Amino acid sequence: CGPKLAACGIVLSAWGVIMLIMLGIFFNVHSAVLIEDVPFTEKDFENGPQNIYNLYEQVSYNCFIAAGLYLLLGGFSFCQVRLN
Amino acid sequence: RLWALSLAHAQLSEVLWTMVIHIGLHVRSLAGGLGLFFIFAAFATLTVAILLIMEGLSAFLHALRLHWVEFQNKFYTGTGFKFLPFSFEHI
Amino acid sequence: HSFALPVIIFTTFWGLIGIAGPWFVPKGPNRGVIITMLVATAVCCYLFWLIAILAQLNPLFGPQLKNETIWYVRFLW
Amino acid sequence: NNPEYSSFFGVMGASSAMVFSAMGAAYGTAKSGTGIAAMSVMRPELIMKSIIPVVMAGIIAIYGLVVAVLIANSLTDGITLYRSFLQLGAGLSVGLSGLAAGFAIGIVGDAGVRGTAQQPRLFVGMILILIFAEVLGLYGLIVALILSTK
Amino acid sequence: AAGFAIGIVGDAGVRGTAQQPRLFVGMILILIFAEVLGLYGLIVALILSTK
Amino acid sequence: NNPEYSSFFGVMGASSAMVFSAMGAAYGTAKSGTGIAAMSVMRPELIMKSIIPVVMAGIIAIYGLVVAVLIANSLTDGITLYRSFLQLGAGLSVGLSGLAAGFAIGIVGDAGVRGTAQQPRLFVGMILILIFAEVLGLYGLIVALILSTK
Amino acid sequence: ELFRSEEMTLAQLFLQSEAAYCCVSELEELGKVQFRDLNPDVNVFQRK
Amino acid sequence: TVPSILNRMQTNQTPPTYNKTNKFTHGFQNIVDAYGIGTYREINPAPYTVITFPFLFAVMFGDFGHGILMTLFAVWMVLRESRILSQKNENEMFSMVFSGRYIILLMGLFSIYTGLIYNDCFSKSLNIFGSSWSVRPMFTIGNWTEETLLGSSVLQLNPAIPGVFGGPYPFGIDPIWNIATNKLTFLNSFKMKMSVILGIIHMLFGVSLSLFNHIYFKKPLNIYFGFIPEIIFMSSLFGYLVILIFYKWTAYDAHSSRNAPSLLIHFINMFLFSYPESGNAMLYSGQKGIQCFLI
Lengths: 84, 91, 77, 150, 51, 150, 48, 295
Description:
The structure is cut from a larger assembly and holds 1 copy of chain A (84 residues), 3 copies of chain B, 1 copy of chain C (77 residues) and 3 copies of chain D. With 91 residues, chain B is an all-alpha fold. In chain B, 63% of the residues lie in helices and 0% in strands. Chain B has 2 helices and no strands. Chain B has helices at 2-18, 29-68. The longest helix of chain B is centred in the middle third of the chain and has 40 residues, at 29-68. Chain B is elongated and about 70 Å long. Chain B starts with a helix and ends in a 23-residue tail after the last helix. In chain C, α1 (4-17) packs antiparallel against α3. Chain C has helices at residues 4-17, 20-23, 31-56, 67-76; one strand at 64-65. With 77 residues, chain C is mainly alpha-helical. Chain D has one domain (1-150). In chain D, 85% of the residues lie in helices and 0% in strands. Chain D has helices spanning 7-40, 47-50, 52-74, 81-118, 122-149. In chain D, α4 packs antiparallel against α5. Chain D starts with 6 loop residues before the first helix and ends with a helix. Chains in contact: A-B, A-C, A-H, B-D, B-E, B-G, B-H, C-G, C-H, D-E, D-F, D-H, F-H, G-H. The interface between C and H is large, with 41 and 64 residues. Chain E: This is V-type proton ATPase 16 kDa proteolipid subunit c.
């Protein structure tokens, strides 16, 4: 490891948590600038927006879960920076 | 040069989004969360190396190029001896 | 109402930073640097925003959008 | 009205704006990187001054990008054959002028960096020579923007 | 073009680095200024293939 | 009335005015630049005098830009082939006379700098030699101004 | 004021040779001063 | 006993050059001195540089995401300052970036400011800004109404015509210009014209600093035969170019877009005394006389 990798994991932890929560929020508000980013399909035009909204909800959860992995990288790296 | 560097920086960032971050989004929670973590870590590494370091140094030097040349050459004559006093403060 | 009022507000905010800001500066050798720093900050920040507004005014063409995006904006706004 | 076999020239414009400027920046970078590498042995402190020719090469590729993108956004199905040649002339005029500048910086970057390590006063001379080399990329962009918008 | 730049810079840079280990960080910067030409070639190619 | 494809030669005029002049100014700057770098080690005082060859190579790029602008601001869809040939002729006349001038500036600039390093009295001779290299760009320019306005 | 290069003056100093060592020491301790060379013959075996 | 007197000399050689420094201003002075050292009583670029360098950089570097990253890095070096001053100095790169910490902070902060107004984080917008753009119901008014049918099958353009368009806009770049396919045309028109305008402004400041330099040296001839004809030459080109740009942004609009004149062509035509009597119309009354007078 070394203190260098622990500092990298701290920086990646802070940035990752910030940005993945911001994206999780932008997906939760169904933001139009994310229409290309959501993995939509030819069936997600049927009856109304409810189908695409369920995918926006899925990618919103995925981003909040991904921020949780950067919290684990945080806790690990805040150990490693003291252990190395 | 202002426009030129801005377009490069913006489109370098755009492609780094388009063929990294976009790939991490998936229709299942576990696969999406894991994909996003590794994809964004790769994005951060490349974003730092290309944009924050290398295009940072480019914009640093070009901003100073415009500043030293196409600004300062209108008024700063820039010819003279540096003040180098004889002192015990150099000990 | 007119967009001139937001322009007057923004112009007044940076105008005070470029005038009243200098009038709050202390004494001692750093004063002339701090005055110039405040003045030039107001100048450069104001000009960048002013050019952006003038380019945003009176567009000679609008946005163009992909088939799926120009559909989904029917419901998302 | 407009023929096909016609958007081709504007595409060769966008391509050549990126290709010959990438060649210009590659010569600029290859020669400057050779000079910097061989120099750093005798003067390891000098690198972050002497990297400037490499950056003055990186901008030539970006002058290619500016025109290349400007052309590629201005392409359309059935584009008038006139506009298509203006985009070819733009693309070559940045592309090959950026190639000229890429040589001009690559050569004076290798020699200027080597000389600067043998004599530190040369650094001001070298960066002044690099302005007069890098401006050849600019003059390709100037005419290319004129041809792209005419 | 980027390949030519990486080839010359990789050779001259590794040789300089082995004589003088200070060069390595400088060589990485100059290598990014070579590698990015391929990425500019990509930026233009992704635009051209879609617009 | 006037043909499609008629603007192509006028575009190649705007391009060649630039490209060949940038190649002339690139040679002139590259070759004189390596001379200045190698000289400066022995003679640090001469650096700021020794830029004149580079400055005169810069003027060959200017003569290429002047014509390239005067061609490019004079293109249209309906261009009579006569006006389009005049623009090709102009663009080659300044482009290649600028190249010739630039090739001369590079060679006389380097020799003139290395000579001035060893013997400062050459500097007046180096300017007089160099005037007769840079004026070839001006004669190319005159013929291109004439042709592009016939 | 820092918008322009700071004001200075050249002065000529009359020095008694026993005071001179201590005078130079106090000038270098003050440290605000730069000397002008009046001895073109200065070299390793020619310096006073 | 000899007090060791002196006199102030009059027949002087040019004295050495100096300016005071502090934690913030030191880096900004170093980047001046590395390019050159002023003459005696010459204007110091460093106080103007404190902003001007961070500004040119943040125009080059105006991504809100990178603005945060650059700020976090520089803030970390400032907060850890008293620790880092005790650490290794033999890493010259780490020592150099730490020596830049305050100038690096200011350029990073301005890159947030430019990033916000340019409305770019990682090539994405912030949704905090309102809409100038038109929702689909706005096309139902018969005017351009085929958009409402064609949009279900093919690419379509907003014309920005009055009654369809949202009118004048008080925020930065509209969020819509990140998702639109034509965005680069509009955004490059902005960055191109902006780069011209800022460059003109900085050259006009540079000649104004030349006047202050010539006043500080108290030379009548340098002002009267230097600055006066210099600024008249510059203003007689530059003022017209900026006036034309600002006039187009006020007098023209979407419905005027067909046959709208080209700014660059009017500038070159002015410089050449060569309006073509045909094609693109003159921009204002008496303009041919004005062009001739200015050049």
